[PDB]
């Protein structure tokens, strides 16, 4: 397909804490943050794109812990006072360790967030 003309910013297997369980599982998806937009595919092959989301109408902030957090997870809300996901207003992306989160964040800024 295409070899050059590429410049990925960040990609990896993340887990959508707040996802539609009842309707199929595989909470884990292949997120690929690119200078253009951030899309998540079933795998790191980018064959059947599930849904593409821009990085101009999005925003990152502290996740609602209420009492106490259980892991490094960041929520993403749309600055256009709209639902980021099908129905969810903010997708809770949980990472393995802080190192990952710190990176993902710094990467977003580069895109324009």
Swiss-Prot record:
Subcellular location: Cytoplasm, Cytoskeleton; Cytoplasmic vesicle, Clathrin-coated vesicle; Cell projection, Uropodium; Endosome
Modified residues (Phosphotyrosine): 85
Pathological association: Myopathy, centronuclear, 1: A congenital muscle disorder characterized by progressive muscular weakness and wasting involving mainly limb girdle, trunk, and neck muscles. It may also affect distal muscles. Weakness may be present during childhood or adolescence or may not become evident until the third decade of life. Ptosis is a frequent clinical feature. Lethal congenital contracture syndrome 5: A form of lethal congenital contracture syndrome, an autosomal recessive disorder characterized by degeneration of anterior horn neurons, extreme skeletal muscle atrophy and congenital non-progressive joint contractures. The contractures can involve the upper or lower limbs and/or the vertebral column, leading to various degrees of flexion or extension limitations evident at birth.
Species assigned in the record: Homo sapiens
Quaternary organization: Oligomerizes into a helical polymer that self-assembles around the vesicle membrane, when associated to the menbrane through lipid binding. Interacts with SHANK1 and SHANK2. Interacts with SNX9. Interacts (via C-terminal proline-rich domain (PRD)) with SNX18 (via SH3 domain); this interaction regulates ATG9A and ATG16L1 trafficking from recycling endosomes to sites of autophagosome formation. Interacts with SNX33 (via SH3 domain). Interacts with MYO1E (via SH3 domain). Interacts with PSTPIP1 (via SH3 domain). Interacts with CTNND2.
Note: Overexpression of CNM- and CMT-related DNM2 mutants in COS7 cells, whatever the mutated domain, led to a reduction in clathrin-mediated receptor endocytosis associated with MAPK ERK-1 and ERK-2 impairment. The membrane trafficking impairment process may represent a common pathophysiological pathway in the autosomal forms of CNM DNM2-CMT neuropathy.
UniProt modification remark: It regulates cytokinesis downstream of calcineurin, and does not affect clathrin-mediated endocytosis. Dephosphorylated by calcineurin/PP2 during cytokinesis in a Ca(2+)- and calmodulin-dependent manner. Phosphorylated on tyrosine residues by EGFR and after activation of SRC.
Annotated tissue distribution: Widely expressed. Expressed in skeletal muscle and the peripheral nerve.
Protein name: Dynamin-2
First and last residue of the signal peptide: none
All copies of domain PH, residue ranges: 8-113
Domain of life: Eukaryota
Mutagenesis or variant effect for residue 109 to P: In CNM1; centronuclear myopathy with cataracts
General function of this protein: Catalyzes the hydrolysis of GTP and utilizes this energy to mediate vesicle scission at plasma membrane during endocytosis and filament remodeling at many actin structures during organization of the actin cytoskeleton. Plays an important role in vesicular trafficking processes, namely clathrin-mediated endocytosis (CME), exocytic and clathrin-coated vesicle from the trans-Golgi network, and PDGF stimulated macropinocytosis.
Family: Belongs to the TRAFAC class dynamin-like GTPase superfamily. Dynamin/Fzo/YdjA family.
N6-acetyllysine found at: 86
Outcome, altering residue 13 to L: Abolishes interaction with MAP1LC3B. Does not affect interaction with ITSN1. Affects nascent autophagosome membranes. Does not affect the trafficking of ATG9A and ATG16L1. Does not affect SNX18 interaction
């Amino acid at each position: 397909g295409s070899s050059g003309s590429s410049g990925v910013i960040r990609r990896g297997w993340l887990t959508i804490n707040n996802i539609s369980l009842m309707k199929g599982g595989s909470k884990e998806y292949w997120f690929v943050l690119t200078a253009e937009s951030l899309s998540w595919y079933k795998d790191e092959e980018e064959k059947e794109k599930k849904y593409m989301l821009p990085l101009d109408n999005l925003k990152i902030r502290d996740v609602e812990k209420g009492f106490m957090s259980n892991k490094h997870v960041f929520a993403i809300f749309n600055t256009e006072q709209r639902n980021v996901y099908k129905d969810l207003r903010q997708i809770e992306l949980a990472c393995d360790s802080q190192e990952d989160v710190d990176s993902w964040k710094a990467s977003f800024l580069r895109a324009g967030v």
